[PDB]
């Protein structure tokens, strides 16, 4: 038997060759692999293939998966591949071909009577964003950045509290505590950071061993060398992340006085640009050493015609030294070159909690636009800036914070966190968004209505979010200290947790698709930033795509 | 008014719709979510003056034309649902590709 | 058509049959407004109603459940008394009986 | 003392002889008993009845009803009479008459200083209706239901998955685990259905010892004669129900195999018309059959001027051939002659989840239109007709389900789940809805205001429906092995827990009101429906009461 | 170096010397007293004051408070002071100057590594108030309390249902587990108040026992003498408090009889002006004892031109004799002289759950505009009417219901319940609610935005008013009986509990600014009141402050 | 704005009479929360342009006729009851049989 690769594309998705616009960008990927048999792929419905004694066999829940994606186009740092995925126990069991081993060959991912199915042919699969810059200033931002597909958040705060607006700390012991508590309400794993700003070590192994699963090093509290020094040495002892927001006003040195107290140690500088905080004007060189991990913040990307003016304010004499048309240019170029490895948001201290994924993909647009096709780029396609993007706000944040053995990707045995998109729709608003194993947010139409499709579709919170079963599909992240001291237990926690490892041994060589390391630098007087001599800039954007498409405000 | 969700849920939809209602008398030509909920306002509207789900089905596809919306939202919608009270209860009402 | 309507068949009820009953001149000495319920035992009503209390002994007022029977500051007037049914048993009030009776 | 019998209506509600329009249909109850002594009525109230020594007697908690609702007018299967309900530890303690034995006559229910009021005067009680075709595509369809006067939901799924949207199966021990945890968060009783379509036994045991109260079958899963008899084998084992969903395609057989396959073992058909599904296009003579419990729908109820235009997209060969306006028109007819039993939804997958009570009732008023009188009608009301539509989605789902222990009527020892009806909003929209004792929503003022009752007036979630006190006033039905197994305890449920039973003794006879098991028969060309050579059919209405008087969209 | 006191009252707030208008009133405040040592001040942000080594210290969590307000204008019973305030486990600390002892002097309050900072420089801040007169209705009416700076509800009621319409009652062992359940959902303290009529004390124990720190007696469930002296008796024996709402019709007595049935035993009395409830048309007489604690509800609170108007329906022969312009115009006076020492709602029963505070200053303002300042007044300023009027809503309530070791004012040790609020919105919409040491509400912009200040900006909750977080912040008041008995455990309440003390020993003279005991007297034709044989009245208001100018609608 | 809960409840009775207005203009006759929110909308509007309690009570009744309703619904609706914000705070409205 044959069939037309168009009416195969509309039945089961595009296959190998076949190239699909991510959303209304100018972005196009191309399907490299597909590990189905051509005739024996998994389709549900009435008379179809999942069914007793044909697609669906007969083996106990032990031996067959709980979930089963058919069909799914996976986009991840390794792949853009065609292939079934199967979950089992809230965790990834196994990217391939899914079936019934009785009648079906090459069958990897089996479907039994405890095999809940769905579809994802046409639809693109992706791992759920991990964003590492959340200042914790009201519980809503969980909501609104699981929508947008992002499924952990690392952060500190305790509410709309001054310190909180400024600063990603949660201060202290008792605040720690209390945080660990809420974290169980909210349906994305859960990661806090503590105030690193103190030169008594004691002060910090408290927080460590309260429960935070890094520090957080902020001018505003002092970022000054002797408490960096401090919070470093407490960083190698207990492995755990740092996270830096150097002296903007130069009041204790300049940028290479910053480095030389951090010494060659592993650390993660939060929006390495310099807009959203940093040594003036030269933070950004910062991403030339091999122990930084740098990161943007998302207000800045991509560098367009209203930028400039909307950042003053928002800020509101160091402004002009802190807001430079000259650095914000260069981002974009040094996000397309792998020099800045990670995008996080900076949630409502400069930063746009829903808008990390999506401004990422903007950048990607972008700089296609005006750099043509990347060096590494084979074919006529668009596959490796696309995974030198989406490994940006996945796996890098997950390798910088040490929770990449939990979540990042989708490879098997890590938890599923997996966002379904429609290509239409792609890095905007999912189709569904699964938090361990289980549906927790997707767009949901008239409740009363004879199918779930009429309008209103808004996002409702699913299942998967709901008392128990939200706590059994969360992560909340603990250091090894409060691990081992039962800090679970004594707070009695109800979420499951993971505990942190791997965070001082990480360096800008391990950052997937990112790890150029660019003579960088900056001119003092004119903010021009150059890699080897030559300068780097770019222009602004008047128009960006995945935008007034598809909101309502 | 005892109004149930659902009815509440409806209110967030006529509301949408007074959005794009404004914006299209502006002379703008509408995206996605201004397109879906302008046309499902008409439905209902539809249903409340009690119109038959088959009229409904066919003067749903002559509210917005192609030249009204932006590039590509056509392609976005093939199709639009909503459910109203008709005189004789709720009803399904689907208009294929809506936008021509 | 009205929604919910009621179709009540013409005619009376009669309330409370086969229970002993008894009149009574009941006075306001008081200066302020006194309403007394159905239920209440007429005989631990305020003190202000002058009438004869002996009589009133286990009784109370021969009305529909849960209406009442106002007394404006020096009004007189004859009130048709039920007697207690149950155990006949009183407490609570004024605290004059505490027991049956 | 005397007092006419409107003043009295007015005072404390309709009494024997008089009757009362069902909202704007034309169906009229007329009051058949009052169990008051007239003059010791009790009324609640500054200076009314219900005040220490009078109508509150001395007793202590253990020895007076925690709740009474008085003069209400019950409108249940055994019978439309007046009287006070007393309900205590959450349960249905008496109907009769309230008041103080000290100085009232025929006192059954005391009240004492622990009983608190619902005044019912004017008002219709009715038990909560059960739903028992629910796919859980998304949980806010529990609070839709409940808001309809609908107190208990059995169905199965995960949520928005593919699986979920087209069957009601809860699909393995993971599955069902994850879902029985969720159930403590939503206000209403849940039973779980497992997926029932797989030709090992031990398969479905799994299932059954991990939660679920039933298994539901269904063609998209497989619907073959394998299949069917493996389930049932499981279920006259372990008590459990079982649901069917038979061979649209008749690929494994007709109609009459599939009656073979299940040997006149017990099984709810559902939506046993056809439209939702079955044997095209015979699955209705499926209710001639003793062992057959069968149900409807709602879309199709009543058969109207839409109904067949709008189906044709909601389902969207084999179109034609399912939707047909012969059974349609039928299925009308058959309800009113007792041929079907019960009423369902099918939530968001042919149903609409709020409409289960309203459409049944629109089935009575526009057959009693057609119709005219039952032959089992006595007087000039149509009190039968009522008591034979409320059963089909009180006490004949509970005994179908094996839950009639539990739930299903107002009848002393059960589940305090009942609602209170406005005569002219009954079964559109109630006062109140009582799940175990507790107000869990009702309609609801200005929060702000000085009452209750100033606009807007929408409903809200009341006590019975927070946190701990939510736990202790609903049901999670368990299979009595999951029961005996522990796994309330292992999965730490939190909520009260029943166990079904007596679901594989349950026949067409047993259902209340509705056990005829007509000689129908459907010509296969025509699709014409007959019972003993008679044709069945009726009209479809142009307009409907319960429709546009009372929704605002 | 110095300073003008108005850059200086820009940067810090005003100090010793300052007047600042409350809202939109002719009400000013002049700051009495500043704690802090001029230059010394701690000031959060970028190049502040609060850093490492500067006004942030090296002590280890123990030694240092977990928050710290910053500069605030406290307002008290106790005084109008500029001050920082000092927090730590929940409780308050400290009133003093906050800094680092390294090297600041005097300082008090010590910051370090585990303080959270909220900035208060230019904010009013003020202990939360306590509502005695709650009919728990539905549970809306926590957030709406909360929302207005109300952190502590004490009432009864079990929902929706007629008696609690009626009555502040939650009637009963069960009703009354089933609540204190529920209060570990809601953001507030709760106290409940269960049924005191009934003439056998065994059934009012039962009640104290089960859990009430109260009981409630009501006209509606029979306020007699016998029932009055059974309810006081067995107060005195569990140390509880009793509320009344005495018998309008008089007919088991007048009011001189009631106060005899009271016999010098301490009471509350709800709404003494009466037109809530209460002997007509003199119950406002009992403010004239020693042993009563007079409350006023809401809706008469200030005397207006639509008063009476409204009053009638709110009620709807003895109406024209519970409404009374001549007791409602006594009314504020008496509050502007001290006769009556507490303000409430009577939520959703004649009262706005939401306008207790509001209403409160808005009776103060007329006062001053038509008696001028008063006699105690020192200073051209309204310190002492506001120190009178604040006593009102937060520490004489608390006093009345023995809960004042827990809550009421700001003082080292008590629970911290703080409101912060800007001056132009003083008493109207708060800017930061605090819940046991945890921001539980506050007004928050668009969560996608850049800062938490976009529009739009309206109250949402925050992490105070999460699970297990707001189980920790609130409290559970039991009765003493209840706590020895375990109630707490066996009910598996998960909040924190406190224990009431002290209400039988309460008396007029123990009111805070309100202990006025007047010779008043009421014609009982004209209905006219009279202290010392001078008539009290006033004049009703057009227009009013903290309306028009703040609300949508 | 700083809404409170009450404001953005209020705005919930605000839209759905947005909803009757125009059908009440489309020549529709009315239906039960159709009426009620109509009907409603005008006194809150009334208390911000100061109207007092006792004007709004019997302008209220002269909103709707029977004539613009449907059938039963006058019935329906003995009274309708709303709070606002008048010059001098909240005051309740009650309306009693305002569609005759
Ligand atoms: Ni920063
Ligand atoms: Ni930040
Ligand atoms: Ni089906
Ligand atoms: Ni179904
Ligand atoms: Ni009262
Ligand atoms: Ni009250």
Redesign the interface.
Same mark, same amino acid.
């Given at each position: 038997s044959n069939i037309s690769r168009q009416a195969y594309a509309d039945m089961f998705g595009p296959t190998v060759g076949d190239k699909v616009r991510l959303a209304?960008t100018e972005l196009w990927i191309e399907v490299e692999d597909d590990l189905t048999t051509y005739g024996e792929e998994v389709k549900f419905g009435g008379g179809k293939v999942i069914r007793d004694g044909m697609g669906q066999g007969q083996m106990l829940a032990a031996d067959c998966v709980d979930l089963v994606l058919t069909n799914a186009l996976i986009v991840d740092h390794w792949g853009i591949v065609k292939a079934d995925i199967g979950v089992k126990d809230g965790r990834i069991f196994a990217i391939g071909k899914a079936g019934n081993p009785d009648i079906q060959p090459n069958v990897t991912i089996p479907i039994g009577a405890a095999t809940e199915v769905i579809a994802a042919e046409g639809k693109i699969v992706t791992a759920g964003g991990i964003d590492t810059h959340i200042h914790w200033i009201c519980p809503q931002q969980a909501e609104e950045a699981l929508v947008s597909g992002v499924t952990t958040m690392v952060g500190g705060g305790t509410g709309p509290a001054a310190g909180t607006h400024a600063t990603t700390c949660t201060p202290g012991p008792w605040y720690i505590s209390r945080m660990l508590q809420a974290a169980d309400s909210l349906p994305v794993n859960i990661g806090l950071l503590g105030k690193g700003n103190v030169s008594q070590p004691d002060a910090l192994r408290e927080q460590v061993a309260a429960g935070v699963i890094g520090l957080k090093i902020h001018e505003d509290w002092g970022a000054t060398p002797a408490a960096i020094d401090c919070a470093l040495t407490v960083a190698d002892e207990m492995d755990i992340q740092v996270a830096l927001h150097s002296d903007t006003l130069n009041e204790s040195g300049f940028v290479e006085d910053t480095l030389a107290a951090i010494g060659g140690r592993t650390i993660h500088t939060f929006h390495t640009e310099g807009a959203g905080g940093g040594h003036a004007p030269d933070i950004i060189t910062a991403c030339a050493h091999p122990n930084i991990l740098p990161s943007s913040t998302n207000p800045t990307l991509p560098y367009t015609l209203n930028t400039i003016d909307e950042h003053l304010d928002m800020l509101m004499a160091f402004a002009e030294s802190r807001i430079r048309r000259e650095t914000i240019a260069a981002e974009d170029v040094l996000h397309d070159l792998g020099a800045f490895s990670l995008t996080s948001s900076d949630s409502q201290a400069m930063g746009r909690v829903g808008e990390v994924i999506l401004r990422t993909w903007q950048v990607a647009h972008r700089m296609k636009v005006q750099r043509g096709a990347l060096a590494e780029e084979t074919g006529d396609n668009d596959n490796f800036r696309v995974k030198r993007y989406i490994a940006k706000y996945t796996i890098n944040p997950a390798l910088t914070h040490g929770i990449a053995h939990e979540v990042g990707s989708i490879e098997v045995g890590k938890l599923a966190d997996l966002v379904v998109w429609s290509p239409?729709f792609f890095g905007v608003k999912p189709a569904t968004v699964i938090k361990g194993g289980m549906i927790a947010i997707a767009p949901m139409?008239?409740?009363?209505?004879?199918?779930p499709?009429?309008?209103?579709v808004?996002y409702r919170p699913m299942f998967g979010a709901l008392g128990s079963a939200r706590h059994h599909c969360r992560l909340t992240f603990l250091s090894q200290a409060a691990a081992a001291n039962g800090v679970a237990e004594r707070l009695n926690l109800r979420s499951a947790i993971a505990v942190v490892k791997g965070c001082r041994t990480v360096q800008k060589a391990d950052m997937v698709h990112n790890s150029l390391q660019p003579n960088i630098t900056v001119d003092a007087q004119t903010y021009e930033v150059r890699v080897d001599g030559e300068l780097i800039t770019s222009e602004p954007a008047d128009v960006l795509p995945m935008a007034?498409?598809?909101?309502?405000? | 008014?005892?109004?149930?969700?659902?009815? *509440?849920? *409806?209110?967030?939809?006529?509301?949408?719709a007074?959005?794009a209602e404004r914006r299209l008398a502006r002379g703008l030509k509408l995206?996605?979510?201004?397109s879906?909920?302008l046309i $499902?306002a008409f439905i209902?509207?539809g249903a409340?003056?009690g119109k $038959?789900?088959?009229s409904l089905?066919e003067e749903g596809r002559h509210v917005l034309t192609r030249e009204q919306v932006?590039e590509?939202?056509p392609?976005?919608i093939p199709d639009?649902?909503?459910?109203?009270?008709?005189?004789?209860? $709720? *009803?399904?009402?689907?208009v294929h590709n809506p936008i021509i | 058509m009205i929604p919910g309507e009621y179709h009540v068949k013409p005619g009376q009820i009669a309330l409370n049959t086969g229970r002993a009953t008894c009149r009574v001149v009941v006075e306001n000495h008081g200066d302020r407004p006194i309403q007394v319920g159905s239920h209440y035992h007429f005989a631990e009503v305020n003190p202000a109603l002058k009438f004869d209390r002996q009589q009133a002994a286990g009784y109370r007022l021969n009305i529909p459940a849960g209406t009442a029977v106002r007394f404006e500051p020096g009004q007189k007037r004859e009130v048709e008394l039920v007697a207690f049914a149950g155990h006949r048993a009183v407490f609570g009030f004024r605290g004059e009986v505490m027991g049956p009776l």
């Open positions: 209304d239409a139409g008239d409740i009363n209505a004879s199918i499709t009429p309008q209103p808004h007034q498409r598809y909101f309502l405000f | 008014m005892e109004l149930t969700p659902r009815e *509440k849920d *409806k209110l967030l939809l006529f509301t949408a007074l959005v995206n996605y979510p201004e879906v909920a $499902s209902m509207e409340r003056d $038959s789900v088959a089905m932006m590509g939202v392609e976005m639009i649902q909503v459910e109203a009270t008709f005189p004789d209860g $709720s *009803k399904l009402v689907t | -």
